[model samples]
Target chain A: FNKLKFGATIGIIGGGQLGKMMAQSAQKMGYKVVVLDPSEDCPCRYVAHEFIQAKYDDEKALNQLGQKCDVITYEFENISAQQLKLLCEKYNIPQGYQAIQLLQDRLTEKETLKSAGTKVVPFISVKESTDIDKAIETLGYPFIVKTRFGGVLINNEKDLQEGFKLIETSECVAEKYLNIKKEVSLTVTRGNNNQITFFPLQENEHRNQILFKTIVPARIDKTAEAKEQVNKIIQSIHFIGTFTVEFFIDSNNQLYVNEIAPRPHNSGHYSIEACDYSQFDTHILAVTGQSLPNSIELLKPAVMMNLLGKDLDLLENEFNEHPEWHLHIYGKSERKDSRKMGHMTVLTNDVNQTEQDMYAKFEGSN
Target chain B: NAMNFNKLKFGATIGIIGGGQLGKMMAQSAQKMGYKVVVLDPSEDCPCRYVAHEFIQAKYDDEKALNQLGQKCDVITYEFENISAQQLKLLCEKYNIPQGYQAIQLLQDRLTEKETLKSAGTKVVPFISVKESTDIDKAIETLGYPFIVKTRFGGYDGKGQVLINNEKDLQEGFKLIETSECVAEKYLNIKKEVSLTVTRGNNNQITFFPLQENEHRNQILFKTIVPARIDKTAEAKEQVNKIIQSIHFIGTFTVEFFIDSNNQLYVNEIAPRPHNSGHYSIEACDYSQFDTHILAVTGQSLPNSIELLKPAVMMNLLGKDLDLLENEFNEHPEWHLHIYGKSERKDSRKMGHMTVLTNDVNQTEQDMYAKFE
Candidate 1:
């Protein structure tokens, strides 16, 4: 039913690694993109049709953009709500403002998730010192206290218990610490008409709650159960775009939703080349009223590793040493301790061999 | 129209005029599409020189260069229009120039373009021709006080046009472009400016892209949106189809339109060659505008035009400081930045563009804009 021809210009709002991967996927599909960023050079700078170096709050910039694009979407949630509201007023910018407002803060995100009938980790709002005792009583000792407005993790048992003491007054959430037997996530795409498709759940390993490695088809045998739970959560939110719901699977096979990202998640990075249509592609299709292709049937088991800052040089050497390893270098310039610089994806039919080889390579290089 | 289904012989040579990044990219597409390309430009070190099958260092307007180009190729197309149309006319008189000499002549000069549009029965903005200072007063009276004084030729990207906000700025504006005759047109308070690109084969087979909504910053296009969200799709098709048919144009041509508050579409101008605005087609479409241009020039059939596979945005990279670009490339490896191989850098020069295509347009914009800021 889509009458528009191929080669339509899609408007993307960010210029980071996710935007870069999405741009790469779009290019492969033969679509051009316009990126609005404040940097003269961002990762997508080389391939985008046009680059605008202006603040996101610059209405002149946004208005100018609204005039030129067929559809509008964003890469992140840091933009002003008013800008998104303005875009919606003028054009059809998907991933509605309700989603943006809900995801902007952790408190709202949990509330939104709980109301959607999804079971989240037991948590209590910590607004002040007086709320701490109640939070401790509700969440129990050895709970994880996290900033309600950002991505902060306290994984260590001692650190998890002590986290509540560090937060004096800033908005935070304290959740009962569940002993994780396995960490997994599922990426789901929902169309405007509520057609939902789910990519296979991926088992993830995190260092301090920051994603380090992701293995697809998850290591668990009850993938069907996990898939059903993820689908339920995606349907519960009635999400009209792509989202990744992180879950903590315990030893008993019980699944608990940890966090939800409304955009393409890092865990789906292997989709860049492994699948016929990536998470980015599905997301774009859902938001633009385009058809989502059938669920991505895994051609092979794949593993993706995030190359943190200063790891590029080492990763480059590893790539040189091993030509078969698929490496992606983001065009980002700066490097810090925790910044995500780029990622590498390795695909193989033999998961055991690939894992061993990858671990060996990692160890040998160090 | 017989060219619609014709299979083009592979490795057929096509000559491109003016060796810039566009030509370089065209040559790349031609090579990819199984055609050989030769570029004629004054710069021996032009970016296209690196990729083309052949490169000839000669002035674009030089007859000797044009004759040599004609001898080596089946047909000719230009990357930019500032080249002398007279030289193109000479080549067409001897051999084929798929875009044709008349198309070049019609687009090269502002005054001639208006006349051409009027003759073609296309609605255009009201304008007055100014050859001298005395003509300026009459032009202002007709077009009104707030208008743009644009040079008849050789102007783009906020250059070659002077804005006359009032009578006091008229003389200074006139002096700014005193070196050449120009046209003064009433500045239309338009709702939006969109561009439609089409390719017409020698057999009269035509393919049209959805109208792309464009955003301009500092007079240079900053973003383009495909499948323009406007009413009257049939009207858009009828208007653009008429322009393409009346022109009997071959190869890629872009007709820009100014849609006013009344929903009327006024023809802004037409470029008879691949346009910067159509650059998105390379990534957004199966058969990109560049590929279409090659097919048209080579007398081949138009390929299937598919719908946009994803939503995307392109950013033009201009730098007053050179290091800014280097820093950007280092920071965002995921973002694709294309740099034109220009030896010299100027504040106003177009160095390259970056494309960011995402499913989430707003999130992509936020992440990208944050890095730039």
Candidate 2:
């Protein structure tokens, strides 16, 4: 495998905040970056060296990107895998479409993980109303019915009927609920040489199905079983670059693989300031054929809080009060409700104290 | 009476004169603060070209392109000292250029720079100006032998200078400068070199970053240690304040000084823009030099306090130094690596820099040299 040279152009398929951060990292390494997105005023539109404004499935735009870049990768996994496979045949995409194909479908992804010998929550495929009944008979009543391709979550029978009326697609997966004590995520980067580096596990808290806060070096003790599960998945799927394996730590201290993101996850954003190498840096190093470190170390303990649309106004006051806060605004124009607009990372010796202090400050923010 | 000045709003386009590494960094800082950046440089593939919002490809003296930049930008500033102050003054006349050209005009030449500092009651090395070859004798007669001969304009990184040891080396040294205009400075017993960066804004508000101890190898700055291990920072700050007050300075500026063996400080030089020694402020300070520079130039008040978040050492990497640490940087995760997108690998050329936030500066410096040596 030939390494990317200085000034080499890298093509990214999305132009969101993740793509903007990835472009910044790539530019820091002396590489040029081009991004393709549907919006003309995307976050990456200003930072990237070039921006191609087009739909994700546009064949002509994808081919234009393939013709210009030495290597190509995506910031999100929503792109059609079949179209990406066609683009990969004519270009150098280190992360092939297979990972995307598996990760985008919950049913297929859970089956793969179970086959790879990792612990997973019980799930059953639901193609129709009768299949939902079958799921209730096998997995029990207190379960969740989610669209296989990430649309909505149905909690009860009434909600399921309403979801079925509104839903355009019928393919779903029903999973039995578990008594989860805490949710943790382990982000790993697999290099071109099959070398993998794991970041410190991060504990996440979700509000209304959106990530709100992430505590680095999870409050709970480290778990070897979670690492083994992530390794098992990485060993099974031959993909290169950074990815995250989220888990559900039950009351009995047992781990269950919750799903995987084939790209950098929001939980690992703290690594930009708290870790020796950021997740974005590791991803670029792997995809560009640059050598990766054997292991990554945490430089500091910190907490990251996401800024939704409502939290934008409070940022000005936050900056004046907390000078130590590392503020990152994604340069988004619109302030839609509950949209991830920006985030902040605070480094502290006492994570508990910092978390409490921040919680007190942003109590009514959400 | 209330003073009136246009305060640039967020998303206003800022015009930068040069598109080198400094310009690239300045563009990055401005972009982070929600501003658009436009750069005018001769090279099409400059370091700032990839990061800048818009780029106007032209030489420094290209009036058409310069006018286009000024027309498109809400404010204009320069990132390097090599820009023509005459042309910049012309641009300032038509557009709102916050940082005046008085500092650049005085600091461009060694003769004028030292004379201004000396007039401001600052200590400067004893020197005599040589306008032609015949004046070299009088310089030697006044400063004596073992003086250094440097060009009056456009010398950097130990270039365009000659060291004279004795009378036998006078003619060779004078001719080696390749310029009829020169200045001869007395060579002194130097102990250490340091620099202080200060920023000034409206209403005479000024902020100063920490003093830095600079180590040079072959006349190129090798490393900068923050909170320099010396007791002369008070005197250094006083001298810098006097120098900045003498000129209508409104942006971040740096002053370099040399401490003799007797611990007496002498003004070495002044930079009208951010110096390489202050690059560590990007990670080690609450607000970096570039941040303060942008704040001052955009009609914003400077912060009341400048906080040093950590003790750090900045190591410079030349083209050759990059080769030594090409594969080793992955192991040193503590060091933040910043590589300038330069195409050439010429020795002695500035390719990148690394900032290591550490508790022990001496050990970090030693470790860096051991890794790059």
Candidate 3:
């Protein structure tokens, strides 16, 4: 399977900041990168060696990327599985259709996580309002109602009376929300032979139900215990690329698995500045048939704070004030309410000092 | 008006003079700073020829050629001060030539530069000017024997300068430099030579980099060590700042000094544009001295201050033949090799420099000089 050296080009399927950063890391390691996306100003457009700006399912763009690249990987898992299947069968794209099919749906991801003995949040699949009633009887109130296929947080409430309108949707899942604790994520990369390396778990803080800040070496009472459990779940997936598992740590310090991303995840952005090998670097290594590093080392404790669309104007002043903070402004011309404009990774040996300095520098800019 | 970062949505093109390796490196820095560059040199195959967005070949003083270059660029700066002051003034009056015409004039003549330094309360070595034989006699009497007589204009790299060991040596020096004037100065018994590079912006803000101690062979700069080990640290940095502000310089410039046995530092001379002594900034600072020159000329707000990433040692590769070092460079990728595209290699011609960077100062110097030996 390993036909090329370390300098081979790896094609990524998306062109967001995740892909852009992945391409940047790949280029640093003397590898070439080609990205496929539909937008002219995708984040990876400038860094990638070649960019195929066609729809995700466009056969010509897919074939061209497959032909030019030595191996194929992806950032986002939203692409059509049929296209991946065709690329694996007709072309020689590795990470065959089965990997994509298993990761595409929440039900399949849950089953896989459960079979691996990972603790999943209590959930019930509902095809209609009658199924919703049945799920309510089983899971009780204060649950999250989500569409079976959609990733957006559609419905959630502290009481069932407030979320009754969620049943009007065609199909959804009602899951009991684990309460009274912090949200954290752990990223793991697996090799073809099931060898795995886990990055430090990060404690995530959300504002208005969207990602705000991620602190590495999560402030958990027993992080070593949690990491061992997280590693088992990643190995059971049997995927040969970088993957991140989000978790809900309850008040009792018991961990509940949230969702899984079968690609380079945002929570691992600190790896770019702090670790010797980043998530994207590991992904490129695994996907290109190279052995993974024995362990991921963090040079310093770092926090990656997303600069959402609202914080675009103050980037220059923010950069000026905190010169040590590495600011990566993705060259996207447009700004929208929900778009990921860019991110800043602040690195310091002392996390408290870094937080105080970064807060003072970025105060009121966001 | 130049392309203002606060106003213009697109980048600007900067015109550079003397398309040697320094010009090539400056072009690289300019491009990375989001500016296009057009270089004007005598060689169509200059090293910077391929890197710059545009290239024009013409003599430095050719008015028609300067006009063609000025037509495409928003601002102009020179790599060397060998060009005529009248031509620089013409460009400044007709088109915008940054670093200003006065800075070029002061640097072009040794006498005017010494006078400028004295006015700024800076110490210069005792000197006497000679215009004729009688004046030469008076200079010898004032400056004493075993002094040096250098031509006032168009002299560099140990050229146009001769030592006056006695009255006999002074006559030969005058005969060689008979065309123009000369400055007879008491040569200092120096322990070390050092240089400081400072960049000034149009906003009247100034930044001084750490002092670089230099080693010379055949009166040509061979190596430089940054953040020189000096006794009076504050005095050295303060003197450099005063000199830069006193000149009202609007771009990157270097000031060379000679430190004598008494630990006294005397100002040697100044380069009006980016100097070879400041080349270590490419790896040492995020905003290089070349990048600062581009920023100053284009009226962009300068960065707060330059930070030294690591100590560096830079060595110049001056060879009578180029192929030996060229082959050696191809084998070592770690050595940052810059080859000036000079058609012919004469003895003592300013060819190119290689920079080796490391946190260890002694090791960096040892590894770099080992290549030349």
Candidate topping TM-score: 2
| Model 3 docking category | incorrect
Error of model 2, residue B292, in angstroms: 4.2
Please tell me how candidate 2 rates in CAPRI terms: acceptable
Residue-wise C-alpha lDDT for candidate 2, range A1-366, written one tens digit per residue: 547755689999999988988998888777789999999878888778888999998889989998989999999985887888888788999988888888778898889988999899999988776676787788876777777775444557677677555334667787888888999999999876677888998999888889888998798874577788887887677678898888998898888999888888899988886776789988988888877767777767888998887777655444533435666667778887688887888777799999998888677776
What lDDT is reached at residue A223 by model 2?
Answer: 56
The clash count for each model shown is 91, 0, 0
Judging by lDDT against the true structure, name the best candidate. Answer: 2
Worst 10 residues of 1 chain B by lDDT: B1-10
Report the Cα lDDT for candidate 1: 0.69
lDDT of 3 by residue, B1-373 (tens): 2222221111567888888777876765554344567889988856566446678999888889888898998878788887888888788777776466778887789998888887788888888777676887787678787788888887878788888787677658778557878887887789998888888765565677777878988898888887675654566676776676566477788888888888888888988878878887764554568767766776656666666655678876676424446545433424444455455677567666666655688877787666666
Error of 3 at A115 (Å): 3.4
lDDT of candidates 1 onward, in order: 0.69, 0.82, 0.71
Q: What is the lDDT of residue B246 in candidate 3?
A: 61
Candidate 3 chain B: 10-residue stretch with minimal lDDT: B1-10
lDDT of model number 2: 0.82
The residue-level lDDT of candidate 1 at A100 comes to: 71
The TM-score obtained by model 1 is 0.52
Cα lDDT of model 3 by residue, A241-332, tens digit? 78887888887878888877777887898786576467876776677666676777665678778777766554544343343555555656
Whose DockQ is higher: candidate 1's or candidate 2's?
2
